[PDB]
Structure formats: structure tokens, C-alpha cells
From Swiss-Prot, chains A, B:
Pfam families cross-referenced by the UniProt entry: Semialdhyde_dh, Semialdhyde_dhC
Binding-site positions, phosphate: 103, 245
Group of enzyme by EC: oxidoreductase
Name of this protein: Aspartate-semialdehyde dehydrogenase
Organism placement in taxonomy: Bacteria, Pseudomonadati, Pseudomonadota, Gammaproteobacteria, Pseudomonadales
Length: 371, 371
């Protein structure tokens, strides 16, 4: 009677974070883990404190059909190929996915249970079997500002993001680090010399970033020492796919199908490891006292952390350096903007790999087990 | 005969950029440059391609009051000390300053002549003697979007910035580079090994940024591999001084004393050397076609660079890596936002040391010579 759960893409980065969290929370104690692979069939699986079967074929429909749940971080290409063939074979199990492939599908639900647990529960009773993790940007934003939407105060939102390299992949994180190392190495001697001219240092650093030898295989441009104001594919409307997801996924999570909330902005890649930062211009539909706003925000969930709008505490708490590897979602710089009393400014930071990827997936798995 | 111009703060970072630009434009052909010092009286001045007198005492009121023009990049502490004494001595010469000291004074004009040449000309005719460079953020924004303000289309503007280390100083730029080096050095061996685990690399990097040995003296926090959502001193209204300067200096440059255009947002420090980037939400007061907006923007001045809203060109052109050391001020990602047709999104990048500091100063000097 214990559910057999198929783990796909566990070896990948997001999957590795998922593995780490599931191990910490002892998730494997309550399920029968079946690890699949697209390269090493028959090989050894990861240690989960119990005996498991050897690695099985992730493309074998016969194998997958025996599963009650499929938890995949393998990617959109894998989902696009296997999922339709599996459903056609009559598989009626639950499909939990990190990839964006099935997010906007009519028979699927974008999961972020601290925000839309009731949506998930109703979908489960309705017979929905597809539950997809939301885009990191949207998930991290809603984890921070869920209280405002829950109060029905948000008219629109303009989101300018500061997104980490982790969102692009493991090789991109490595490239960012190599780029930082290359930038520093070019002036390593000069940095030791106090009498070295800063403009000479700056000149050499700029040349290094522009040089061919600068590692730019995965980004196509320097990230370290710079930034990239475009993430994911270009769309015919002038949006990047990353920016398009902001409005589409926010309103689906909140189930705002009739009157959707306008969400837009610019998605920018910055030189951070695995934390997304977002500077937000928020239009509220009425004048609400700031302290009440802070109350609505902080009381929504136990992971959001209201950082007082003071300098040294903001410098220490509201940064990728302070958030990385943690489930904490700090939000600060909360104040009324000069445009009017209905204009709210906000800055938030969140780990891209946890709440922005892995954590909603394992939590969705636990929800299935509690039913 | 030839105007005697005093140069203060020529040796510093902004001053050095100023000297190099004045050399390139051959400004020293038109003036008698008198170089002053706060540390090396009688010493040797910079190489400006012509015979100059030995360094004079920058605190000598007797010498300073003989000067037709004073162009200082020495700093606010110097201005606050010398300027009142100098005016008290009956000095009626012109004062050109990079420091923010006299910006909001009624007898002073914030200079950005491609944007407010007419304001400058009227001030000169009126007898105004004080001409001050604007804050880097404001100057760079207006160089890109001057065409919209000139057409009187801007209702308000929300500015989320991505600011470089150069705005904080030379030692901050050095710290940024040292931070990048420390980050890379902690995982140098792992990066060279293709089979290394990404989560192990990430763990060590996160640990390094948090360690005490991480160079954070000047920023008070990690910048490399992170960001800092607070620049300059905290104000009682919840703004930082940097954010406050947005509305204050924009409207003074435009000479809008009556009904000021609301300008607000969040000023964030990122790991860039000397380029400020800004993500903008612009509310227009009229329905204008996007192509007409592009025309107004690009036709305003020959330094703004309209980057077509396409992925490849944006990645290549609209970055600190591309802009660094140039007088080009690219603006891109221009499109109407989901909130409405009067909401305009824009992303711009500009060099902080040129148009954000040194360039409006030497240009103001040229204007004085053309009187
Ligand atoms: O980004 P993301 O985390 O969402 O997905 P990701 O890490 O890009 O996923 C990579 C996928 O490719 C395979 N793979 C190839 N080389 C690998 C390596 N060196 N380490 C781990 N997996 C590797 C894995 O599948 P298999 O483990 O099934 O080959 C994994 O599921
Ligand atoms: C903006 O832009 C303005 C310019 O600031 P900044 O960053 O250019 O100032 P900075 O680089 O800190 O230099 C300021 C002054 O400090 C003195 N100084 C002391 N040690 C120095 C060194 N090792 N190298 C160069 N100069 C040194 C120089 O004056 P002396 O040549 O008189 O010693 C220089 O003019 C600021 O007021 C800010 O508000």
C-alpha cells in the first residue's frame, strides 16, 4: 500500500537539491523510491538509507506505468517526449514536474502550497493528476508578497529582477565563478600594490571581460563584472519568455482567470550564485497604512521575513549572501513611493533552488501522501 | 588674456578621468591650467602636454581668488571648507564642482548640458556663478531618456538601479575585485575538475562570502557574488540618500520647481566596475505609439544609443561590459507594459565616471569659454 515514487533527474542540479531536502526531511521513509536514468540503466542509485532497485530506464513506458507518482527534474525535453506517450498507455498516476512544459496545461496545476494549498486540494478532489512547479521568479515573489494578493489589494506590479546564475544551470554557475577568477587574475599583482593606479586596473579588467579568452560559452556574454538584461527566448511581443511567465503563472497560481492582475517588468541576469532578487513597484487598489501592509506580508507564511527598512540591517539580511541555501524569503525596503499612497516599493531575496524549484515539489509529494 | 582655470582634485579617480578627457578634447589649448594640491605643495602636476606651474596650495584663498574658473573634483569636504571662505573674500569667478555640496542651493545650477543647455544659458545671463555636476544615477538616466522629458510626456518614473562600485570609490572597486578573487580561489581546484559536484562548489562559495576573512571593509557586506539594496545614508522617510536624489535632482535639472515629476525606486549596488544600469517603469501622460517614443529618445542627443528590442543585440550592447569606458548611453527593452499603453518599460546602461561624473564638468567649462 506504500506508494512507488519514480525519481527522474535526481542526478541533475535541481534534483540534487531535491535529494538533499528529501534526505533532510526523511521523505524516503514514507515512499518506495524508484530511481530512473537516461544514460546508466542498471547502475547504482543514490543512498537513501534503504535498499533500492538498480537504475531503471526512464524511457520505458512499461516501467513507468507501474508507478503511483512520478517526480521529475529531468527537464522540459524529457517531459515533452515521455509524458504524452505515458498517458496514452493509460497511466493514471501523479506527475510532479519542475519543468515549465505542463504549467499552462488545462489539466495541470502550478503548485506553491504555502500560497495556493486550497487550489491544490480542490484539484486533487477533482481528479487532477498533474502538478507542476512554478517559475522561480513567480514562486519567490509570491512567497514574499502572498499576503498582499491574499488581501486582494494588488492592482498591478512591475517587477525588475536580479536573477542568479543557478537559474541558467550548473555550468553557468561554474562559468560565473571562472569569470570572476579571470577578472581578478588580470590585476592580481596590481591589487597587492597600493600605489597602483585604479584606472589602470579598470582598463585591464575591462579588456579581460571583452577578451576572447574570457569564459563566455554558456552565457554568450560576460556576467561577472556585468549583467545581462535578457533571460530565455525572445517572444513576438517584445517580452522574453521569462518576463512573459510573470503574468501568466502568477494569475494561474492565484486562480485569477476572470480578471487577471497585470504583472510585467524586466528580467535581468546578475552575478549572484543561486539567489534571485527582485525590486518591485506595487500598485495597491487603496491607501493602506504601511504597518498594516507589513502585517499582511509577514503573517502570510512562516518563511517570509520582514526586514526593517533601516540601512545596516538591510545590508546584512536582504542579500543573496545571507539567503543562499536557506528557506528564508526576506522582504524589505517596504515604503510608500513618491507617486502616491497607493504605490508600494519592495525588495525581496529568495533562493532559486529551494522555494524557486525543489521545495514546492517535495512538499507536493508529501501532500499526496497525506491524502 | 587667457582664462586661468584652477584644477582641484585632478589626481583622484573622477579627476583623472576628467584630465584624460580634457586631454583628448584638447581643452588645455584654450585655458591656463593652474593645478592645486592638498598634500604636495610645490610638487609636480600631471602631464597635460604644456608647461604648467608647480602645484599650488588648494587652501590658499589668496591664490584661489585670482582664478577666473575653479573646476574641482576634490570632494564635498573641500567645497564645504573653501567655498564659503572664497566667496567671503569677494571672489566672483565661476565654480564648477563634482561634489553634491552645492547642488540644491538656489544660487547654483545642476549641469547636464545635452539636457538642460537652455537652463544653463539663462543662468549664465542671470549672473549665476555656481555650476554643479549631478548625481551619476540622474545624469545617466536623463542622457538616455531626455527626449521623453523634453516632450513633456513623463507623468512619473519608478527606477530600479543596478549600480557599480565606482560610485562608492576607488577602494570599493578594489574590494569588489578582491571579493571576486576570494570567491573563485575557494573553489579553484573544483572548477578545474569537470567531475566535481556543483553543490559542493556552491557550499564552499557561500561559506567564503560569509567568512570573516572575506574583504568587506568598505562595502560592509559581500558585493561580489551578491548585491546590496542600500546606497548612501538612511533618511527619515525610509529612502536612502541615493534614492532621494532621483526626484530632487531630476526636477532641478529640468528646472521644474512648481509641480515636480515623481521619481522614486530602489538603488541597488551590483558587482560591476564603473557602469550604472537602470530598469525603468515610465508612466506617460499621453498615448504615444512605441515607434514615436523611440524617435523622441534617439533624436534627443548623439550619445544615447537606441538598442532594438531583440535578444542577441541586447545581450551584446545593453551591458556594463559593452558600455564601460565609452560615452555611449544605450537604452533598450523599450515596450508598452501589461499595465497599460501609457506604461513604458526601459533598460539603460551608462558609464558612471564619464557622463555620470567628469564629462558634464569639462563641457560646462567649454560653455564658459564660449561666452
Ligand atoms: O538544471 P537542472 O538541475 O534542472 O537539470 P540538469 O542538472 O541540467 O539535468 C541534467 C540531466 O542530464 C544528465 N546528466 C548529464 N551529465 C550530468 C552530470 N555531470 N551530473 C548530473 N547529471 C548529468 C542527468 O540525467 P541522467 O542522470 O538520467 O543521465 C540529469 O538529469
Ligand atoms: C563624486 O565625485 C567626486 C570625486 O571623488 P573621487 O572618487 O575622484 O575622489 P578620490 O579618488 O578619493 O580622490 C580625492 C582626493 O584625494 C587625494 N588622494 C589621496 N590619496 C590619493 C591616491 N592614492 N590617489 C589619488 N588621489 C589621492 C587627492 O587629492 P590631492 O591630489 O590634493 O592629494 C584626490 O584629489 C567626489 O566628491 C564624489 O562626491
Amino acid at each position: 500500500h506504500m506508494k512507488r515514487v519514480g525519481l527522474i533527474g535526481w542526478r541533475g542540479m535541481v534534483g540534487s537539491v531535491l535529494m538533499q531536502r528529501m534526505l533532510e526531511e526523511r521523505d524516503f521513509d514514507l515512499i518506495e523510491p524508484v530511481f530512473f536514468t537516461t544514460s546508466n540503466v542498471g547502475g547504482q542509485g543514490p543512498e537513501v538509507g534503504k535498499d533500492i532497485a538498480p537504475l531503471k530506464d526512464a524511457y520505458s513506458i512499461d516501467e513507468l506505468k507501474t508507478l503511483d507518482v512520478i517526480l521529475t527534474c529531468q527537464g522540459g525535453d524529457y517531459t515533452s517526449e515521455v509524458f504524452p506517450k505515458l498517458r496514452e498507455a493509460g497511466w493514471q498516476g501523479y506527475w510532479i514536474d519542475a519543468a515549465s512544459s505542463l504549467r499552462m496545461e488545462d489539466d495541470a496545476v502550478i503548485v506553491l502550497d504555502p500560497v495556493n494549498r486550497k487550489v491544490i486540494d480542490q484539484a486533487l478532489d477533482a481528479g487532477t493528476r498533474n502538478y507542476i512547479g512554478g517559475n522561480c521568479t513567480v514562486s519567490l515573489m509570491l512567497m514574499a508578497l502572498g499576503g498582499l494578493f491574499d488581501a486582494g489589494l494588488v492592482e498591478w506590479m512591475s517587477a525588475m529582477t536580479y536573477q542568479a546564475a543557478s537559474g541558467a544551470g550548473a555550468q553557468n554557475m561554474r562559468e560565473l565563478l571562472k569569470q570572476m577568477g579571470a577578472a581578478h587574475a588580470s590585476v592580481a599583482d596590481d591589487l597587492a600594490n597600493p600605489a597602483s593606479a585604479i584606472l589602470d586596473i579598470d582598463r585591464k579588467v575591462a579588456e579581460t571581460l571583452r577578451s576572447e579568452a574570457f569564459p563566455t560559452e554558456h552565457f554568450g556574454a560576460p556576467l561577472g563584472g556585468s549583467l545581462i538584461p535578457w533571460i530565455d527566448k525572445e517572444l513576438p511581443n517584445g517580452q522574453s519568455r521569462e518576463e512573459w511567465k510573470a503574468q501568466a503563472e502568477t494569475n494561474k497560481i492565484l486562480a485569477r482567470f476572470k480578471n487577471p492582475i497585470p504583472v510585467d517588468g524586466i528580467c535581468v541576469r546578475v552575478g549572484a550564485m543561486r539567489c534571485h532578487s527582485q525590486a518591485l513597484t506595487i500598485k495597491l487598489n487603496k491607501d493602506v497604512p504601511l504597518t498594516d501592509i507589513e502585517g499582511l506580508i509577514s503573517q502570510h507564511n512562516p518563511w517570509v521575513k520582514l526586514v526593517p527598512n533601516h540601512r545596516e540591517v538591510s545590508v546584512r539580511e536582504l542579500t543573496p549572501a545571507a539567503v543562499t541555501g536557506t528557506l528564508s524569503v526576506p522582504v524589505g525596503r517596504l515604503r510608500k513611493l513618491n507617486m502616491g499612497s497607493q504605490y508600494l516599493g519592495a525588495f525581496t531575496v529568495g533562493d532559486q533552488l529551494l522555494w524557486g524549484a525543489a521545495e514546492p515539489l517535495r512538499r507536493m509529494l508529501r501532500i499526496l501522501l497525506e491524502r
